[PDB]
């Protein structure tokens, strides 16, 4: 590991997230129908923290994230969650690196400013000691190309009953300086059966600084009424506890 | 008719006695053919095993499971199953299975059950209130246990608090049990908080070792990869049969359906949240199921007085699907003669439809 | 599954001796390397196991406290060592790869796989 | 301690049974095992769980639990069965697997 | 009705109770009238040598319905192969003998 140091210290910035972070709250097909969910979603109208710098200090992880980053390099790499983060506890680290997508609750002895370097990738700067491995799964490999945004990827993390959940939809956009205004869900993307206690996380980038932001709101115990179209695609929502109206 | 009005005389008028039902011919059965044998042998053939306060879990997935040799096993001392009954567990398919082992006292094999009290049961495993699984013991007093008395086996007596359902406690912190700090070293108060219980191969069944293996049976709805060891049937569909798709089992007629799942949504529901909709576990076309016809059966007869000839109504069937056969809206009329003469009504049939008897039964 | 164990000694009494059993070809750290005597020419005898990954020990009656059986999981090699060697210790002395798995409940002991054993002789 | 006959003779291709016998301590739990010692060799799993064969064996070898003993049966026996049969058991009684006093089969 | 059931297995004689004795040797009815008397007779059936004349049906191809009896002596075939009539792997005699 080596500590970057050349970083300039300014507090977080914030934004709305307007209606963002809804997702496939089950795996059963139902269509034409209202239904009322009480699981973690991210509330209408939110703040959320609005990052660029080298900006990426350490940040809360509390009962689940809202994760949005707007690219056009792929400059996004992955995240780290734990409780430590040191080696001294178990630890998860996801990296969607040159060659594949590795997941790993390894117990990995991080580096206190990991991250990745690149248009090729070259560095690979994210942890040094790593034993006792209990779960590992390796995506087949590919390519990705590191070089207005055009690439939208929306992440929600949930930690339940052993599964870490992974939820994700890919749009285009087109605004320079914000979140859009509209309704998207996010599809599952994988249930990774990995028992690993996640309570704070890191974003991973890949000198000079590229054309990039990322977001980072949180989940509440919140009902939800969740409109279901005819192909079963969640359409609309409404968050009973935003207002009397919603209510 | 008669024994419906507990009586020997009927009147006139429409009786509604019985239900009309096409039975299922077919019984079909779709599991997914991964018939890689499921290493459920390996959690209790393990030579080592955990501690009760730090209990191994082994997720068992993508197999096919025979859950005969179980149950067939002459040995085991306690099977006993919240939820779901041992012979009944071949019939379905689980989407997740875990398969917690430790080694518990024999006394307390009673406390690693649903919603009961002690030392394991608070501070070192406990069972979820609303467990759906099956709890095997065994007298593993002959195994685990040394003249010399074995230490390896850990349980926590004491915690600040209660455990969790399914909740590890790994930590070793000194358990302080006065006022003063203990000061994080052993004194008056202070005290390794897992004491390790020693057996001798003479003890009582108090004391004797019962080793366990909890299989907690995940019935959440996604896609499911642990079975049970049924052979699968080929698929008919426009037919009334009996199905069982990945453990969801029914009587219906499968169609050809038009709806379009999402690659990762494997059964649907209706309005009611009852299932209408099934992907099929080997092919992933999107089924349709509707129930097998059915429909309330009417007796339309004149009185005993007049005549024991009597037509029946099957409501809302059709006359294709019952086997002077007269179809109307309201179903299909069976043993009434329709005839282009109106009258007025009689005996009410439906739809506009009366009968009478004019002799003969006429609708 | 090919334990390779040793060679032959021949030794004095009241010296300390010790026998190797290495193992290869499988997962050593996980199995039991349980030992076994033979005097020459008469049944075997069971004389206790040793679990390489734990360093658990068990014993015959006939042996607890007659022999000190140790492991190194490190170099894949467990060791049955003598306290003290006697004059009738005198054996065809065999290590094996035991298993205890319950197989759904019903016990089994069943030294699956032999080395070729450490002839001791004693005068 | 398992008690067995210390010799068996037969003609080969012929049957002989072998006989164990134990208390209800040792043959009262599922323990029949069996190994035979060629001239030279180290035993090997030749029968376990009462009768189950390992892959690996001749098929001409049966043996079966009659109550607190043992019984062993080669059919059709042949020359090189000249190997110190054992059947072994663990007490249970301060545990300990204990072998038979073995039997030396002879072929006439 | 009279036997000898083991003890563990009393529980198994009682309404809507499993196991090797309630599925595949004697079934009390699961709307039973009836008292069941059991005492330790311990001294009485028990031998120093063990017991064998009280058989149990260990394996049966279907539980037993209620208050049938079971005088059945085939060889179960537990493998796809006939196992022949004969003891021999997967044919064992169906009534095993506790001691
Ligand atoms: C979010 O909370 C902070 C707390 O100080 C507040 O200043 C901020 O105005 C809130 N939301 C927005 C959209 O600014
Ligand atoms: C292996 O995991 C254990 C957790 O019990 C930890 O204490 C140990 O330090 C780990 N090994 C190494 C080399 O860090
Ligand atoms: C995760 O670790 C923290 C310690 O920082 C602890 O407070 C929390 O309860 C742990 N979570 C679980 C699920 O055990
Ligand atoms: C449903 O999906 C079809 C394509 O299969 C699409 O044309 C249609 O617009 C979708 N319906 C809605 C309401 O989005
Ligand atoms: C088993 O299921 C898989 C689905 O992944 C399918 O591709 C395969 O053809 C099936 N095998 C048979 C014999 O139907
Ligand atoms: C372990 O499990 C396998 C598969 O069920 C079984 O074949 C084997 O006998 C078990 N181990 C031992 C020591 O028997
Ligand atoms: C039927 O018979 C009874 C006597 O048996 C009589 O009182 C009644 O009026 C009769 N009704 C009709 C419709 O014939
Ligand atoms: C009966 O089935 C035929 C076709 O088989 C259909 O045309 C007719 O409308 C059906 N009648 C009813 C009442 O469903
Ligand atoms: C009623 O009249 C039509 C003529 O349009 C005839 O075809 C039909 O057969 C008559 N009803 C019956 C039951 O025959």
Redesign the interface.
């Known amino acids: 590991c080596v500590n970057l140091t050349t970083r300039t210290q300014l507090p977080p910035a914030y934004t709305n997230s307007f209606t963002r972070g809804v997702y496939y709250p089950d795996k059963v097909f139902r269509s034409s129908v209202l239904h009322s969910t009480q699981d973690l979603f991210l509330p209408f109208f939110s703040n959320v923290t609005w990052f660029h710098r080298f900006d990426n200090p350490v940040l809360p992880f509390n009962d689940g994230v809202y994760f949005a980053s707007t690219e056009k390099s792929n400059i996004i790499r992955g995240w780290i969650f734990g409780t430590t983060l040191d080696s001294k506890t178990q630890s998860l680290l996801i990296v969607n690196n040159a060659t594949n997508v590795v997941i790993k609750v390894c117990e990995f002895q991080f580096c206190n400013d990991p991250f990745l370097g690149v248009w090729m990738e070259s560095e690979f700067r994210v942890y040094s000691s790593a034993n006792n491995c209990t779960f590992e799964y390796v995506s087949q490999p590919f390519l990705m190309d590191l070089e207005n945004f055009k690439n939208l990827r929306e992440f929600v993390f949930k930690n339940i009953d052993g599964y870490f959940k992974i939820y994700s939809k890919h749009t285009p956009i087109n605004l320079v300086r914000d979140l859009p205004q509209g309704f998207s869900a996010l599809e599952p993307l994988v249930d990774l059966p990995i028992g690993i206690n996640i309570t704070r996380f890191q974003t991973l980038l890949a000198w000079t600084a590229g054309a990039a932001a990322y977001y980072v709101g949180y989940l509440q115990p919140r009902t939800f009424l969740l409109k279901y179209n005819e192909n079963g695609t969640i359409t609309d929502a409404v968050d009973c506890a935003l207002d009397p109206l919603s209510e | 008719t008669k024994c419906t009005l507990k009586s020997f005389t009927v009147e006139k008028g429409i009786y509604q006695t019985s239900n009309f039902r096409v039975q299922p011919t077919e019984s079909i059965v779709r599991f997914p053919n991964i018939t890689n044998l499921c290493p459920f ?1 390996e959690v ?5 095993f955990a501690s009760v306060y730090a209990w191994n ?1 082994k ?1 068992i ?1 993508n197999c096919v499971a025979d859950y005969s ?2 149950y ?6 306690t099977f006993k199953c919240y939820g779901v ?3 009944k567990l071949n019939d379905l398919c689980f989407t ?1 299975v ?1 398969a917690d082992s430790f080694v518990i006292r024999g006394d307390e094999v009673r406390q690693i059950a649903p919603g009961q009290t002690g030392k394991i049961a608070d501070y070192n495993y406990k069972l979820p209130d609303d467990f759906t699984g099956c709890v ?1 013991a ?1 007298n ?1 007093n ?2 685990d246990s ?2 010399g008395g ?1 230490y ?1 086996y850990l349980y926590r007596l004491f915690r600040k608090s209660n455990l969790k359902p ?1 909740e590890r406690d790994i930590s070793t912190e000194i358990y302080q049990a006065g006022s003063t700090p203990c000061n994080g070293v052993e004194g008056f108060n202070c005290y390794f908080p897992l004491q390790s219980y020693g057996f001798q ?1 003479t003890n009582g069944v108090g004391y004797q070792p019962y ?1 366990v293996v909890v299989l907690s049976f995940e019935l959440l ?3 499911a990869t642990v079975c049970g060891p049924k052979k699968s049937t080929n698929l008919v569909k426009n037919k009334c049969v009996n199905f069982n798709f990945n453990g969801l089992t029914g009587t219906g007629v499968l169609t050809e359906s038009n ?4 690659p ?6 209706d ?1 009611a ?1 009852t299932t209408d ?1 099934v992907r099929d576990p080997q092919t992933l076309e999107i089924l349709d199921i509707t129930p097998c016809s059915f429909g309330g059966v009417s007796v339309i007869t004149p009185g005993t007085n007049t005549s024991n000839q009597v037509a029946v109504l099957y409501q809302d069937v059709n006359c294709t699907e019952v086997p002077n056969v007269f179809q109307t809206r309201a179903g299909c009329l069976i043993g009434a003669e329709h005839v282009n003469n109106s009258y007025e009504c009689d005996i009410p049939i439906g739809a506009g439809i009366c009968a009478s008897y004019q002799q003969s039964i006429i609708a | 599954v090919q334990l390779v164990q040793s060679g032959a000694e021949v030794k004095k009494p009241g010296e300390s001796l010790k026998i190797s059993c290495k193992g290869s070809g499988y997962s050593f750290t996980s199995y039991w390397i349980g030992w076994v005597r033979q005097m020459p020419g008469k049944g075997l005898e069971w004389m206790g196991v040793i679990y390489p990954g734990d360093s658990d020990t068990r014993y015959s009656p006939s042996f607890q406290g007659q022999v000190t059986i140790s492991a190194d999981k490190s170099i894949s090699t467990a060791y049955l060592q003598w306290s003290s060697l006697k004059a009738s210790d005198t054996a065809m002395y065999y290590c094996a790869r035991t298993q205890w798995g319950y197989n759904y409940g019903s016990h089994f002991f069943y030294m699956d796989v032999w080395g070729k054993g450490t002839t001791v002789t004693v005068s | 301690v398992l008690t067995q006959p210390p010799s068996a003779s037969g003609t080969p291709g012929q049957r002989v049974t072998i006989s164990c016998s134990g208390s209800s301590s040792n043959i009262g739990s599922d323990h029949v095992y069996w190994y035979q010692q060629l001239p030279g060799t180290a035993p090997k799993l030749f029968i376990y769980r009462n009768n189950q064969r390992p892959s690996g064996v001749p098929d001409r070898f049966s043996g079966s639990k009659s109550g607190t003993s043992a019984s062993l049966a080669i059919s059709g026996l042949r020359s090189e069965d000249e190997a110190d049969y054992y059947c072994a058991a663990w007490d249970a009684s301060l545990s300990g697997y204990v072998f038979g006093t073995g039997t030396k089969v002879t072929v006439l």
Not at chain 2, 44 to 48: C, D, E, G, P, S
Not at chain 2, 72 to 77: G, I, W
């Open positions: 042998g209790f053939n393990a030579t080592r879990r997720r997935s040799v179980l067939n096993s002459a040995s085991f001392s009954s041992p012979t997740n875990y095997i065994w593993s002959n195994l040394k003249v074995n390896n399914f191969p080793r709805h996604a896609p709806k379009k799942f999402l990762f949504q494997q059964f649907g529901r309005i949240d909709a």
